[PDB]
Amino acid sequence: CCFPMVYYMEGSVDNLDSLLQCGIIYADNLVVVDKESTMSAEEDYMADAKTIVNVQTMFRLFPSLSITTELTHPSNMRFMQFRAKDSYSLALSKLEKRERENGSNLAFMFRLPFAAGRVFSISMLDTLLYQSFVKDYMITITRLLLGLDTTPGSGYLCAMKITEGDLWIRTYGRLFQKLCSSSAEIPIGIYRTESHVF
Amino acid sequence: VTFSTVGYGDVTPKIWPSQLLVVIMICVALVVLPLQFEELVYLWMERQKQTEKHVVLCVSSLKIDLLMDFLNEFYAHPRLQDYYVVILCPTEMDVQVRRVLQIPLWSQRVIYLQGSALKDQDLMRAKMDNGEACFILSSRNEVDRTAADHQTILRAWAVKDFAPNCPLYVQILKPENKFHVKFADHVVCEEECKYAMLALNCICPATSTLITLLVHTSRGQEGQESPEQWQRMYGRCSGNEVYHIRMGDSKFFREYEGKSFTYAAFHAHKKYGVCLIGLKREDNKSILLNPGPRHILAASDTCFYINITKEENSAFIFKQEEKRKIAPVLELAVEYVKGYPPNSPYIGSSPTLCHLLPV
Amino acid sequence: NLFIPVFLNCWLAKHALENMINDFHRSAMFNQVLILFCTLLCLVFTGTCGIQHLERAGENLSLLTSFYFCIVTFSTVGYGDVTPKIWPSQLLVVIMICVALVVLPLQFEELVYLWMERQKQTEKHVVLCVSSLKIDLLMDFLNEFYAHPRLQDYYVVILCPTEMDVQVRRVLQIPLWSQRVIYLQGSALKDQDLMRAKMDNGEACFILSSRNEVDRTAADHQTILRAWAVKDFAPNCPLYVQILKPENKFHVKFADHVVCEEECKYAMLALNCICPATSTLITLLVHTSRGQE
Amino acid sequence: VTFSTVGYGDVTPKIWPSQLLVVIMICVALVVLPLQFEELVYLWMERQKQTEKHVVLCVSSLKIDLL
Numbered sequence A: 001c002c003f004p005m006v007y008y009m010e011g012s013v014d015n016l017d018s019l020l021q022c023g024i025i026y027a028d029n030l031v032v033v034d035k036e037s038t039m040s041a042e043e044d045y046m047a048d049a050k051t052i053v054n055v056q057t058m059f060r061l062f063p064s065l066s067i068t069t070e071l072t073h074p075s076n077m078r079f080m081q082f083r084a085k086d087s088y089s090l091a092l093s094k095l096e097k098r099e100r101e102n103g104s105n106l107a108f109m110f111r112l113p114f115a116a117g118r119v120f121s122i123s124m125l126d127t128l129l130y131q132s133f134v135k136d137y138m139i140t141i142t143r144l145l146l147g148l149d150t151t152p153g154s155g156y157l158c159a160m161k162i163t164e165g166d167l168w169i170r171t172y173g174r175l176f177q178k179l180c181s182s183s184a185e186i187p188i189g190i191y192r193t194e195s196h197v198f
Numbered sequence B: 001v002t003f004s005t006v007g008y009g010d011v012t013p014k015i016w017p018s019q020l021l022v023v024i025m026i027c028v029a030l031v032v033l034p035l036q037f038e039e040l041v042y043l044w045m046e047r048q049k050q051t052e053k054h055v056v057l058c059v060s061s062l063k064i065d066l067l068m069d070f071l072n073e074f075y076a077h078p079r080l081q082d083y084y085v086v087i088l089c090p091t092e093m094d095v096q097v098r099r100v101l102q103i104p105l106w107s108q109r110v111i112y113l114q115g116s117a118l119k120d121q122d123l124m125r126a127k128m129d130n131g132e133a134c135f136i137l138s139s140r141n142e143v144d145r146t147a148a149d150h151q152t153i154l155r156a157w158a159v160k161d162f163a164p165n166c167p168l169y170v171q172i173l174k175p176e177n178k179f180h181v182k183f184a185d186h187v188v189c190e191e192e193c194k195y196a197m198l199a200l201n202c203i204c205p206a207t208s209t210l211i212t213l214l215v216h217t218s219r220g221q222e223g224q225e226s227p228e229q230w231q232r233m234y235g236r237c238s239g240n241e242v243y244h245i246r247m248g249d250s251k252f253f254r255e256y257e258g259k260s261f262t263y264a265a266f267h268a269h270k271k272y273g274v275c276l277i278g279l280k281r282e283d284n285k286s287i288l289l290n291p292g293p294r295h296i297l298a299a300s301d302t303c304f305y306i307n308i309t310k311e312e313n314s315a316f317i318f319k320q321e322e323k324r325k326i327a328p329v330l331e332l333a334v335e336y337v338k339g340y341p342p343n344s345p346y347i348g349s350s351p352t353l354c355h356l357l358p359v
Numbered sequence C: 001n002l003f004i005p006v007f008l009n010c011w012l013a014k015h016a017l018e019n020m021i022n023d024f025h026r027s028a029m030f031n032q033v034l035i036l037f038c039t040l041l042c043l044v045f046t047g048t049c050g051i052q053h054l055e056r057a058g059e060n061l062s063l064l065t066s067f068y069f070c071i072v073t074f075s076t077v078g079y080g081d082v083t084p085k086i087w088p089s090q091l092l093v094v095i096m097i098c099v100a101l102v103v104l105p106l107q108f109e110e111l112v113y114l115w116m117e118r119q120k121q122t123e124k125h126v127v128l129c130v131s132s133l134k135i136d137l138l139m140d141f142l143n144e145f146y147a148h149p150r151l152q153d154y155y156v157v158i159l160c161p162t163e164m165d166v167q168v169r170r171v172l173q174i175p176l177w178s179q180r181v182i183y184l185q186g187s188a189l190k191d192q193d194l195m196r197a198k199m200d201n202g203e204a205c206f207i208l209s210s211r212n213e214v215d216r217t218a219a220d221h222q223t224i225l226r227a228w229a230v231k232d233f234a235p236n237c238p239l240y241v242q243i244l245k246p247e248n249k250f251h252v253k254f255a256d257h258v259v260c261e262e263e264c265k266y267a268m269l270a271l272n273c274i275c276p277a278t279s280t281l282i283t284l285l286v287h288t289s290r291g292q293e
Numbered sequence D: 001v002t003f004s005t006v007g008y009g010d011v012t013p014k015i016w017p018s019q020l021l022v023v024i025m026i027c028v029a030l031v032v033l034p035l036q037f038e039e040l041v042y043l044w045m046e047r048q049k050q051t052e053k054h055v056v057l058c059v060s061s062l063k064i065d066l067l
């Protein structure tokens, strides 16, 4: 009740009227969380079927909207934004198969929805828990990045937009130097954007 | 030799009574031994219904995906190649689990016991008292999540009661139950991390991808054969992991002792390509992400950095560096109120200074 | 120049070999039948060497004859042409038989244990991906498929996540359908089950909806996911999808041929109201028949 | 008679290659016949799953008291 501009409304992602009433024309993001009871299917990979189909329907209706989803199985992240009549999306399948041949755990990584940040799976949390057997600091680092735990004197994960006026900083190292010489910020990585007309 | 039905014939009865005795003896054997055989197979049918440094995985219902995730994440480390996994599951083994466990690679590494952590007998069958780690995992497939959380809390309590000196790695679904297993060595809350990552994706795009590729062990060899440059670079940078090493022993940061944290981080990135994200002072137990320019490095600090490979394993790049032979950073330095939310919904919720309505 | 029974070292060779297999493959039941064969070979080796050397004093038999004697007594045959006639050769045969009769049943028990644990073609094939296979649906598919002379050489792979029904078993161990129908227990959403069915070289994939399911939208979602998975895995495999509800018909529009159950059913009912027995006309027009009824 | 593992021994090879032939043939039988036996028992397991004036009782679920 004390948070500003936080509203609720009854509805679902499968009915268009509720999304239009909440306002999806003006929605920057649409976060969809899977239902708890949807995982009752005997076929384990079919637990995400309803969520995937609903998100695909919303993606077809609103192509420019940014939808973020959480899936139970990492093998279903290929289905988030499914373009069947697309050569690149099916060559990514061959790339994933080639990576999986070499014993790669991150075979899902080359899928476009995952790379763009549209979908993640909670299996990364299990991987984090198993990693903590070797890296006891990993859970604390992850929580600090997410802001889940707040220790005084600890930084937070922010993001800065590289505009056309900042391209005189031609290099990532020069940007690192400028940030450490002006605001003492440490850049983790880059969220890169390319034109990939389908 | 006539027992085994060989019948050499070198020595053979040649009289009436001995031939009769052989005959009756053969009959008695062939009538009395199949009874013993049928009793033995009856008992066999009723009966049908290693090394040190092992790890126990206590779950409620084991699936092929969860098991494969655990095996891939566990046996990707060279130090844990000799470890074998004991799986305590109250349910019977699934067919796919059987198919993966009769693979020769996983045949002797994975031991599956059908039992419960709340029974001490199943706990000593798994040898928890000498186990290296117990992984209590929540059942995300269960419709009722509070019941699953209660079951995981009871499993953690039972393991702590039985084997107190066994580090616990508990996975909790709902944050309200996160303070019941606070005694555990490492607790991961599903909802907290999931929703925080979703919120950050709303704030910083593809934060979930960053965390997923940072907590996954990988050599950074993915997509190196691709003709697309973006795939090559993306799969190379996905091999980065967060590593910790003492600052005095760290060949990356040792030369920057007594300098500012930002100066050290920038110059380490410029020289070797490591991203010093934070540190932990020896006096405190708190890890600080980017302490700032006012922080002065010390030889006893534990520096956390992002790099493709560990410093211990970066001997090849150190030997390559040996084979090699903007302002500058300085080595030393309706209106809304701001306050904490009034009613924290659960115990353990970290208080965060937030933008708040005046009333 | 004194006798030291070196021939017993084959037991240690077998022990080292079985210690080696436990780590490296070189394959689950083969690894243990290999140990069974090695145990048999070691037994025959020890036996023949023992009989030959101990009968060097009497019967002065060669190693070839000793090997022949040991193998013919191995099969419990006992010809009697060459037989030990001295005290310790006879006793060695006795202990050798007892040792075999105690060791080999253990190997047999291990083999049958592994066998119980293990219990739980041509080109131009067609894959039938269903959710639950019944006898009527399978018979309909077989009758409609194999009524064409061009598809006589085709065989059918059935991908079903459930276990084979009893009636399906009775029809599939018929000799006519024994080698034509392959039943794989798996899901199209797992790529391993897709390569087991060899979808990449398949001629056609038939995704069929579960009309028996109470919730039809869930079944339609499952069929949409199956079609998407097959397209992702084998893009050059024509899809024949069967959709229950018309709302979900535009998610599988990429498929080669899509049939909507509700649309066709209600259109045929409406035409029966307009043109009587239109459904009969369509049913007899889409059924392959020689007209001999 | 050597098939049944009987081995009378009245007629028996006395020369080297006939002896090696019976040896190899015994080995071949003991290695090739168990495959037929395992196939037969496999098919038997898969297979596991009068007079005139008779009367048919068509029920939905048969219990002991009704029968």
Ligand SMILES: COc1cc(-c2noc([C@H](C)NC(=O)c3cc(C(F)(F)F)nn3C)n2)ccn1
Residues within 6 Å of the ligand: B002, B003, B004, B005, B021, B022, B024, B025, B026, B027, B029, B030, B033, C076
């Ligand atoms: C072939 O694989 C086998 C066979 C048997 C076996 N079961 O019954 C017999 C015969 C009928 N009986 C005999 O050999 C026999 C005769 C005599 C005696 F002369 F009275 F002293 N004592 N015995 C024990 N063989 C057991 C195990 N493994």
Ligand SMILES: COc1cc(-c2noc([C@H](C)NC(=O)c3cc(C(F)(F)F)nn3C)n2)ccn1
Residues within 6 Å of the ligand: B004, C043, C044, C046, C047, C048, C070, C073, C074, C075, C076, C092, C093, C096, C097, C098, C100, C101, C104, D005, D030
């Ligand atoms: C009948 O179908 C079979 C029987 C067996 C078998 N199991 O045990 C034996 C007997 C007890 N033992 C022998 O014959 C024997 C004796 C000797 C030796 F003299 F020491 F050299 N070496 N052997 C191998 N037969 C196995 C397979 N198929």
Ligand SMILES: COc1cc(-c2noc([C@H](C)NC(=O)c3cc(C(F)(F)F)nn3C)n2)ccn1
Residues within 6 Å of the ligand: C075, D002, D003, D004, D005, D021, D022, D025, D026, D027, D029, D030, D033
């Ligand atoms: C005991 O109950 C049985 C045993 C068998 C059987 N299986 O293998 C064998 C032996 C190893 N082999 C032989 O006897 C043998 C030798 C020869 C030949 F000399 F080459 F001509 N031809 N044969 C067939 N017995 C089968 C059925 N019932």
Ligand SMILES: [K+]
Residues within 6 Å of the ligand: B213, B214, B215, B216, B217, B218, B238, B239, B240, B241
């Ligand atoms: K990584």
Ligand SMILES: [K+]
Residues within 6 Å of the ligand: B217, B218, B219, B220, B239, B240, B241, B307, B308, B309, B310
């Ligand atoms: K790495």
